[PDB]
Design a binder for this molecule. Structure first.
Ligand SMILES: Cc1cc2nc3c(=O)[nH]c(=O)nc-3n(C[C@H](O)[C@H](O)[C@H](O)COP(=O)(O)O)c2cc1C
Ligand SMILES: Cc1ncsc1C(=O)Nc1ccc2ccccc2c1
Ligand SMILES: O=C(O)c1cc(=O)[nH]c(=O)[nH]1
Length: 365
């Protein structure tokens, strides 16, 4: 479309040249929350529909956690064309996160580095925000547009498990799925929660709290993992997931690695790297986790998706759903319709009746 090219060539670079990344993001969140968006043209066909996690998803393309940290733009995000929305990460108490600047663009690499450190309005503010539209969400969900809530922990928290348990109790009843985020590179000691003993202990507590919720308010529980795990870590995670009956995995968060070939002046900034240089590392992690869980644990694939091909590669590798964030930073809102339209065309070209037929197809070759 001409809208794609206008945003890609004119609008986004001009926004970029004018505002630093954090300011541009705040403005984007504001515009989104007010529905100030280019025409919602693409109509989802039935072949994009997916049933997973106890829900119908009208299309498999979602917005990744981090864009709407505080639950302010949910409805604007559905209007943008996402088949599902994930907000967060949300920490139990409000906290400011790291000192600025804490987000950096690498235009030459179509990548972003961020070290926000879980800036969050906190559970109580997000709870009230979600309660104010709770019944509208219930209809959205019924209509195939579910809501996920991603949980973090406070910087000064002594007991990580209790932070997550609080999140489950407070936001669990408002969510179609919860995400236990143990893969942020920007909170000290957080990623060590991916280790086998700590993870089993953490998730047992999380699942107990979840199971104590009334039935209609009882979300699926997913774990979001890093792209930088050893083979040992991945095998352990797969084992804990199957031992405890975890409902799904989100694969993956940003990388602390700096792949060879990065050109951006800011490539050596501390933080998690997202976007294009993350893409295949993410796709390969999905492929491994799908195999280790025997295709029985739903995976949401995320990391450097900016096209239908990117989405389909993750789906064929084993993802039932995909998410994007960074692509929006460079292509703007038209990227959502673009990904969906290309995905549908590729599914037809490759002989799939629909998205469901494509999930894990690479493993059956
Ligand atoms: C600026 C920024 C903030 C993010 N904040 C969160 C977060 O709070 N919680 C989380 O689980 N992931 C967070 N992420 C990670 C994304 O959800 C996603 O896993 C990652 O960026 C890879 O996807 P992408 O290449 O499409 O951006 C953040 C990513 C970025 C770029
Ligand atoms: C201000 C405005 N008026 C009509 S469309 C429009 C607009 O393009 N808004 C934007 C512009 C850029 C965006 C980038 C990411 C997410 C949402 C975004 C919304
Ligand atoms: O808040 C952060 O800085 C943040 C959290 C997370 O999960 N992933 C990320 O890249 N950054």
């Amino acid at each position: 479309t001409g809208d794609e090219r206008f945003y890609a060539e004119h609008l986004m670079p001009t926004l970029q040249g004018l505002l630093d990344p954090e300011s541009a993001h705040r403005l984007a969140v504001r515009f989104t929350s007010l529905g100030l968006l280019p025409r919602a043209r693409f109509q989802d066909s039935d072949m994009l529909e997916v049933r997973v996690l106890g829900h119908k998803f009208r299309n498999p393309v979602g917005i990744a956690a981090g864009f709407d940290k505080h639950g302010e733009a949910v409805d604007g995000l559905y209007k943008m064309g996402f088949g599902f929305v994930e907000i967060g990460s949300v920490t139990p108490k409000p906290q400011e996160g790291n000192p600025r600047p804490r987000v950096f663009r690498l235009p030459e690499d179509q990548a972003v580095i961020n070290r926000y450190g879980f800036n969050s309005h906190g559970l109580s503010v997000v709870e009230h925000r979600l309660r104010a539209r709770q019944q509208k969400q219930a209809k959205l969900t019924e209509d195939g547009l579910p809501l996920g809530v991603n949980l973090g922990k406070n910087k000064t928290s002594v007991d990580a498990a209790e932070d997550y348990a609080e999140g489950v109790r407070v936001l669990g009843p408002l969510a179609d799925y919860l995400v236990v985020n143990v893969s942020s590179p920007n909170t000290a000691g957080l990623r060590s929660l991916q280790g086998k003993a700590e993870l089993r202990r953490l998730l047992t507590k999380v699942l107990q709290e979840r199971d104590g919720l009334r039935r209609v308010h009882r979300p699926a529980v997913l774990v979001k993992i890093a792209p930088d795990l050893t083979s040992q870590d991945k095998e352990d995670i797969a084992s804990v997931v199957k031992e405890l009956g975890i409902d799904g995995l989100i694969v993956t968060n940003t990388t602390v690695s700096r792949p060879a070939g990065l050109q951006g002046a800011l490539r050596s900034e501390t933080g998690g790297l997202s976007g294009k240089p993350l893409r295949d590392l993410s796709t390969q992690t999905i492929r491994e986790m799908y195999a280790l869980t025997q295709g029985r644990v739903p995976i949401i694939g995320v990391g450097g998706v900016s096209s239908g091909q990117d989405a389909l590669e993750k789906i064929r590798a084993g993802a039932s759903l995909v998410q994007l964030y960074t692509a929006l930073t460079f292509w703007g809102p038209p990227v959502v319709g673009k990904v969906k339209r290309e995905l549908e065309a590729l599914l037809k070209e490759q002989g799939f009746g629909g998205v469901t037929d494509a999930i894990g197809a690479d493993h059956r070759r």
